[PDB]
Enzyme design. Structure first.
Site, PDB file in Angstrom:
ATOM      1  N   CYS A  12      39.488 -12.803  -0.222  1.00  0.00           N
ATOM      2  CA  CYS A  12      39.905 -13.367   1.049  1.00  0.00           C
ATOM      3  C   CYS A  12      39.295 -14.765   1.144  1.00  0.00           C
ATOM      4  CB  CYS A  12      39.375 -12.497   2.176  1.00  0.00           C
ATOM      5  SG  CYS A  12      37.571 -12.436   2.164  1.00  0.00           S
ATOM      6  N   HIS A 124      25.758  -1.105   9.108  1.00  0.00           N
ATOM      7  CA  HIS A 124      26.363  -2.186   8.342  1.00  0.00           C
ATOM      8  C   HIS A 124      25.802  -3.551   8.816  1.00  0.00           C
ATOM      9  CE1 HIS A 124      29.566  -4.849   6.727  1.00  0.00           C
ATOM     10  NE2 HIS A 124      29.811  -3.871   5.865  1.00  0.00           N
ATOM     11  N   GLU A 126      27.190  -6.510   9.217  1.00  0.00           N
ATOM     12  CA  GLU A 126      28.029  -7.173  10.234  1.00  0.00           C
ATOM     13  C   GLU A 126      27.732  -6.642  11.633  1.00  0.00           C
ATOM     14  OE1 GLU A 126      32.298  -7.947   9.508  1.00  0.00           O
ATOM     15  OE2 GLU A 126      32.614  -7.648  11.645  1.00  0.00           O
ATOM     16  N   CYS A 197      40.205  -8.571  10.652  1.00  0.00           N
ATOM     17  CA  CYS A 197      40.707  -9.853  10.115  1.00  0.00           C
ATOM     18  C   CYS A 197      42.043  -9.703   9.435  1.00  0.00           C
ATOM     19  CB  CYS A 197      39.701 -10.452   9.129  1.00  0.00           C
ATOM     20  SG  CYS A 197      39.491  -9.538   7.576  1.00  0.00           S
TER      21      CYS A 197
HETATM   22  O1  LIG Z   1      33.717  -5.023   3.733  1.00  0.00           O
HETATM   23  P1  LIG Z   1      32.334  -5.512   3.933  1.00  0.00           P
HETATM   24  O2  LIG Z   1      31.277  -4.380   3.558  1.00  0.00           O
HETATM   25  O3  LIG Z   1      31.991  -6.069   5.345  1.00  0.00           O
HETATM   26  O4  LIG Z   1      31.908  -6.744   3.000  1.00  0.00           O
HETATM   27  P2  LIG Z   1      32.693  -7.284   1.708  1.00  0.00           P
HETATM   28  O5  LIG Z   1      33.060  -6.207   0.606  1.00  0.00           O
HETATM   29  O6  LIG Z   1      31.753  -8.314   1.227  1.00  0.00           O
HETATM   30  O7  LIG Z   1      34.039  -7.996   2.130  1.00  0.00           O
HETATM   31  C1  LIG Z   1      34.000  -9.355   2.585  1.00  0.00           C
HETATM   32  C2  LIG Z   1      33.490  -9.460   4.035  1.00  0.00           C
HETATM   33  C3  LIG Z   1      32.274 -10.071   4.335  1.00  0.00           C
HETATM   34  C4  LIG Z   1      31.858 -10.200   5.654  1.00  0.00           C
HETATM   35  C5  LIG Z   1      32.655  -9.716   6.665  1.00  0.00           C
HETATM   36  C6  LIG Z   1      33.870  -9.161   6.335  1.00  0.00           C
HETATM   37  N1  LIG Z   1      34.273  -9.068   5.036  1.00  0.00           N
HETATM   38  S1  F3S Z   2      34.886 -12.340   4.744  1.00  0.00           S
HETATM   39 FE1  F3S Z   2      36.997 -11.783   4.306  1.00  0.00          FE
HETATM   40  S2  F3S Z   2      37.296  -9.536   4.770  1.00  0.00           S
HETATM   41 FE2  F3S Z   2      37.826 -10.805   6.638  1.00  0.00          FE
HETATM   42  S3  F3S Z   2      36.117 -11.243   8.082  1.00  0.00           S
HETATM   43 FE3  F3S Z   2      36.121 -12.923   6.573  1.00  0.00          FE
HETATM   44  S4  F3S Z   2      38.288 -12.956   5.843  1.00  0.00           S
END
Ligand SMILES: O=P(O)(O)OP(=O)(O)OCc1ccccn1
Ligand code: F3S
Length: 309
Positions: A12, A124, A126, A197
């Site tokens: 992403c 978590h 976040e 997201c």
């Molecule tokens: O799915 P999570 O465990 O939150 O984290 P990642 O596997 O690093 O995915 C990216 C991310 C970071 C930060 C926020 C959202 N998504």
């Molecule tokens: S880290 Fe990636 S998984 Fe969503 S909240 Fe930000 S676009």
């Protein structure tokens, strides 16, 4: 055996920004660069950066004076930010813009002394960061994970109540939680739908389409990747066998013995090289050319801060 690839899958915009923040800090200032928590939840990305001289740590005390410290993509509490603020550090923030957006709304609530409810998973990072934006003892900040958690929650003033969500939840489960909040707390205010997201929404939609073609779904992602877990989960709930795997070596051949159609996706923190290796392995076990499915377009990029170019 036909191999199908979900679309979208993998990186992403937030992940791509956060990794480049660390890479570029290492390029501008040399090793070591300290990073609070795994920059993203992917062992391969973390071990890469680690072997490049980034040092992952869990508290700011572990970081020495005059150091460079990166906050991970998951974001950090005010307490953590303040502890860094006043500790002689150069700080760069790799928190994803789509998490910061949720942070600003929790902060708003806290200033007006109005209660907020976060939908997310306890423990978590976040969630820790997002709850840690609320500080006002007059109001409150509550975590719910399920309709039952909602059915049990009492608040001080339900006339002045807002909700927010973690970015990486199940769209469907979250929807059930929101319907519950709305039935319990009719005045509650939130976003039109949720704070999940685009990437999480898109990868879920993508793995649904995949799962209705494939008997077995492999999801490339680490065990502690929330979004990656939702992908495997979604497939499993559709009645398909689905496995969360860090890499090709995790594939056990029984999983795909006599399977006509196998699907592969990747969570938002999983580099494409891992997917490529997984597909190579499947081909060894008798699969053909990987066919990518048609997918919803993604076009968002988040740039690194100017001073890290
Ligand atoms: O799915 P999570 O465990 O939150 O984290 P990642 O596997 O690093 O995915 C990216 C991310 C970071 C930060 C926020 C959202 N998504
Ligand atoms: S880290 Fe990636 S998984 Fe969503 S909240 Fe930000 S676009």
């Amino acid at each position: 055996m036909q191999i199908l690839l979900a679309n979208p899958r993998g990186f992403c915009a937030g992940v791509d920004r956060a990794i480049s923040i660390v890479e570029n800090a290492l390029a501008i200032y040399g090793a070591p660069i300290y990073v609070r928590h795994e920059v993203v939840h992917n062992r391969y990305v973390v071990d890469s950066l680690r072997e490049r001289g980034a040092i992952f740590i869990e508290q700011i005390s572990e970081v020495p004076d005059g150091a460079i410290l990166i906050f991970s993509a998951h974001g950090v509490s005010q307490a953590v930010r303040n502890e860094a603020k006043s500790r002689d550090l150069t700080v760069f923030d790799a928190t994803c813009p789509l998490v910061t957006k949720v942070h600003m709304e929790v902060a708003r609530a806290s200033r007006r002394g109005e209660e907020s409810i976060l939908i997310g998973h306890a423990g978590h990072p976040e969630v820790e960061g997002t709850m840690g934006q609320y500080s006002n003892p007059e109001g409150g900040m509550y975590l719910v994970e399920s309709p039952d958690d909602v059915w049990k929650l009492t608040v001080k003033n339900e006339e002045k109540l807002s909700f927010m969500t973690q970015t990486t939840l199940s769209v469907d489960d979250t929807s059930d939680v929101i319907d519950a909040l709305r039935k319990r707390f009719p005045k509650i205010v939130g976003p039109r739908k949720d704070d999940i997201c685009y990437a999480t929404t898109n990868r879920q939609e993508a793995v649904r389409a995949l799962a209705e073609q494939a008997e077995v779904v492999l999801v490339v992602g680490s065990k502690n990747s929330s979004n990656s877990n939702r992908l495997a989960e979604l497939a499993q709930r559709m009645g398909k066998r689905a496995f969360l795997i860090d890499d090709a070596k995790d594939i056990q051949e029984e999983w795909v013995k006599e399977v006509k159609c196998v699907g592969v996706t990747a969570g938002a923190s999983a580099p494409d090289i891992l997917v490529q290796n997984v597909v190579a392995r499947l081909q060894q076990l008798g699969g053909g050319e990987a066919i990518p499915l048609e997918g919803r377009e993604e076009n968002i990029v988040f740039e690194v801060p100017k001073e890290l170019r």
